[PDB]
Amino acid sequence: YKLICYYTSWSQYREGDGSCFPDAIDPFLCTHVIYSFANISNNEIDTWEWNDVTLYDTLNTLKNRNPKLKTLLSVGGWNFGPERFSKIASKTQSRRTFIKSVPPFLRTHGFDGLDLAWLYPGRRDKRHLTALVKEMKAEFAREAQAGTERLLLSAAVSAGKIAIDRGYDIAQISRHLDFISLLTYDFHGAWRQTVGHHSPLFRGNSDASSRFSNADYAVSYMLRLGAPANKLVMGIPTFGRSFTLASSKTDVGAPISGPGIPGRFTKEKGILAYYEICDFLHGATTHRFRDQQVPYATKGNQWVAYDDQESVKNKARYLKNRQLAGAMVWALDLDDFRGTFCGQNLTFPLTSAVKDVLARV
Ligand SMILES: CC(=O)N[C@@H]1[C@@H](O)[C@H](O[C@H]2O[C@H](CO)[C@@H](O[C@@H]3O[C@H](CO)[C@@H](O[C@@H]4O[C@H](CO)[C@@H](O[C@@H]5O[C@H](CO)[C@@H](O)[C@H](O)[C@H]5NC(C)=O)[C@H](O)[C@H]4NC(C)=O)[C@H](O)[C@H]3NC(C)=O)[C@H](O)[C@H]2NC(C)=O)[C@@H](CO)O[C@H]1O
Numbered sequence: 001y002k003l004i005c006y007y008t009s010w011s012q013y014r015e016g017d018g019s020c021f022p023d024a025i026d027p028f029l030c031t032h033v034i035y036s037f038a039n040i041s042n043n044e045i046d047t048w049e050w051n052d053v054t055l056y057d058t059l060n061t062l063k064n065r066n067p068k069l070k071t072l073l074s075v076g077g078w079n080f081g082p083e084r085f086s087k088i089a090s091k092t093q094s095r096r097t098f099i100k101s102v103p104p105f106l107r108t109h110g111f112d113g114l115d116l117a118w119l120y121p122g123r124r125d126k127r128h129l130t131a132l133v134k135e136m137k138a139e140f141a142r143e144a145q146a147g148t149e150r151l152l153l154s155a156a157v158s159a160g161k162i163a164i165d166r167g168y169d170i171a172q173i174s175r176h177l178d179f180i181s182l183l184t185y186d187f188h189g190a191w192r193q194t195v196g197h198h199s200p201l202f203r204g205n206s207d208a209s210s211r212f213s214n215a216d217y218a219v220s221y222m223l224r225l226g227a228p229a230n231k232l233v234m235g236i237p238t239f240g241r242s243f244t245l246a247s248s249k250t251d252v253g254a255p256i257s258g259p260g261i262p263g264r265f266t267k268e269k270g271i272l273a274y275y276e277i278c279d280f281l282h283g284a285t286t287h288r289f290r291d292q293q294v295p296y297a298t299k300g301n302q303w304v305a306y307d308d309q310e311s312v313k314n315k316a317r318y319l320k321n322r323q324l325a326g327a328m329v330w331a332l333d334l335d336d337f338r339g340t341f342c343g344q345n346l347t348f349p350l351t352s353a354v355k356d357v358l359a360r361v
């Protein structure tokens, strides 16, 4: 089983304990660590933060402690305009120029592969997304001829039925991609004003519409479309999505006036790192949707939907039963990486639970 863990560029800037460097990563925890995110300029892969070349190095020296560890760089991300990806992928000339610029870059910085996080291609991109994956892979095969190990190629895909129908030719890209990471946790889409869990496992028996929104449907749908199980990786979040209530109602359906207050370290409305949620729980009331098998908490007018150790062990058990390739975690720097925020003195509590269940067979 594979354990793909994302580490983000900008977590170095958080204050105090919030700050996280490649340093803090247990080399034996995951099988693959993906650095986010690389940028694109003058049509070539390129760096993003001034000090990336350094952190690139830091991350990749973990391979000295664990020689089996594989690292990848990710291009794209949500703060990267899809129009930009779209503009590069549509013109064979600008597309070829980018592809050709990738291998040398990965090799200089010691990465073992590239990860595509185009979020998200639209109806008019489906065809180009395919041209890009296909041609890029071909470039990796051709490059392995130089006598070095073939570079890996992966992609982060939307887990929403409509997004999948609109911009992905799943059957096509799965034959060229090494693994596909299902973004099964952006379900309660930023849009509406009703409390809801962003990463439910199951349908949530007590609800008629938007049954398409849960890990289970997404996974079954991908297999129906043609993605083989041995390349599917299910995304497990390590953060919580918060809300500022607009009434005293706290159960399913309750109204929402907007996103929740920022976390002390995370400084971003609507989300909270797991280690922040641990602190938050003190004095909070905890509930758990039996149907979807995921927890949620409230305190004051703040409602938080999140994942704890057992909801995470659950998804992991599920993924094994459907015989998928492994799990994907977003993200290491949001988990309790110091191990000093969540009761127990364990480091990376959430990612380990996934790893424990995965190591059982
Ligand atoms: C599978 C997959 O691909 N993942 C999906 C993700 O894309 C989803 O969301 C996540 O991605 C977005 C980015 O795409 C991420 O956005 C980040 O937001 C933060 C926090 O609000 C930004 O952090 C700030 O970054 C700037 C610079 O980049 C920092 O400023 C710098 O300051 C130093 C001095 O401090 C200077 O030396 C630098 O020059 C300087 N830059 C400037 C401004 O001059 C700043 O310190 C920092 N933090 C602060 C103040 O809080 C960060 O840049 C954004 N990311 C990028 C790469 O642009 C978003 O936070 C993230 N969401 C979560 C919850 O992780 C993900 C969401 O669910 O799921 C996947 O589907």
Ligand SMILES: *[C@@H]1O[C@H](CO)[C@@H](O[C@H]2O[C@H](CO)[C@@H](O)[C@H](O)[C@H]2NC(C)=O)[C@H](O)[C@H]1NC(C)=O
Pocket: 039, 040, 041, 042, 047, 048, 049
């Ligand atoms: C990512 O690459 C982009 C595009 O090359 C960089 O974009 C900006 O840089 C120019 C400065 O000379 C601006 O004139 C442009 O408005 C802008 N390019 C755009 C929007 O296409 C950007 O600096 C890079 N980002 C990082 C973190 O390096």
